[PDB]
Amino acid sequence: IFKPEELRQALMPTLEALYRQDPESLPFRQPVDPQLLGIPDYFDIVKNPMDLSTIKRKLDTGQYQEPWQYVDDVWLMFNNAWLYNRKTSRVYKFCSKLAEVFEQEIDPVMQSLG
Ligand SMILES: COc1ccc2c(c1)N(CCCNC(=O)c1cccc3c1N[C@H](C)CC(=O)N3)CCC2
């Protein structure tokens, strides 16, 4: 059983590491509004949108029972971006950088949580 405060304390630094990436985190910080962004087919392609602010809210409000659910949301965010965007795009390349950062951050943390 994982207490929500323990998950927050352990996992939030990994999320903060993503947020600190500039310019790479910028398209990932807030939920996608497809009409506002001029990408009206977004939710047709991306069935389960995810973004950094949603993940933070889930940690803040105790919505994860176990740490792999958090890892899965981060990876969902990445996979959505690699699915929707062209390989030359900023979002695609930025996603790839975030995945590099996340891999390094999450490893010791997951080992520590068990
Ligand atoms: C589009 O690339 C950039 C790169 C840098 C910056 C911005 C936009 N802008 C705008 C940020 C807001 N737009 C997006 O978030 C976005 C736009 C088009 C497509 C995608 C968008 N992002 C999500 C992940 C959905 C996605 O899969 N693809 C801010 C200044 C910095």
Curated annotation (Swiss-Prot):
SS bonds (residue pairs): none
How is this chain modified after translation? Methylation of the KIX domain by CARM1 blocks association with CREB. This results in the blockade of CREB signaling, and in activation of apoptotic response.
Entry's transmembrane regions: none
Q: Where is this region: Interaction with histone?
A: 41-87
Q: Where is this region: Interaction with ASF1A?
A: 79-97
| Ranges for domain Bromo | 2-109
Q: Where in the cell is it found?
A: Cytoplasm; Nucleus
**What's the effect of swapping residue 92 to C?**
In RSTS1; mild form; impairs binding to ASF1A and acetylated histone H3
Q: Which domain of life is it from?
A: Eukaryota
State the function annotated in the UniProt record.
Acetylates histones, giving a specific tag for transcriptional activation. Mediates acetylation of histone H3 at 'Lys-18' and 'Lys-27' (H3K18ac and H3K27ac, respectively). Also acetylates non-histone proteins, like DDX21, FBL, IRF2, MAFG, NCOA3, POLR1E/PAF53 and FOXO1. Binds specifically to phosphorylated CREB and enhances its transcriptional activity toward cAMP-responsive genes. Acts as a coactivator of ALX1. Acts as a circadian transcriptional coactivator which enhances the activity of the circadian transcriptional activators: NPAS2-BMAL1 and CLOCK-BMAL1 heterodimers.
- Relay the domain remarks: The KIX domain mediates binding to HIV-1 Tat.
Q: Which disease is it linked to?
A: Chromosomal aberrations involving CREBBP may be a cause of acute myeloid leukemias. Translocation t(8;16)(p11;p13) with KAT6A; translocation t(11;16)(q23;p13.3) with KMT2A/MLL1; translocation t(10;16)(q22;p13) with KAT6B. KAT6A-CREBBP may induce leukemia by inhibiting RUNX1-mediated transcription.
Quaternary state and interactors:
Found in a complex containing NCOA2; NCOA3; IKKA; IKKB and IKBKG. Probably part of a complex with HIF1A and EP300. Interacts with GATA1; the interaction results in acetylation and enhancement of transcriptional activity of GATA1. Interacts with MAF and ZCCHC12. Interacts with DAXX; the interaction is dependent on CBP sumoylation and results in suppression of the transcriptional activity via recruitment of HDAC2 to DAXX. Interacts with phosphorylated CREB1. Interacts with CITED4 (C-terminal region). Interacts (via the TAZ-type 1 domain) with HIF1A. (Microbial infection) Interacts with HTLV-1 Tax, p30II and HBZ.
Name it. CREB-binding protein
Q: From which organism does this entry originate?
A: Homo sapiens
Gene this chain is encoded by: CREBBP
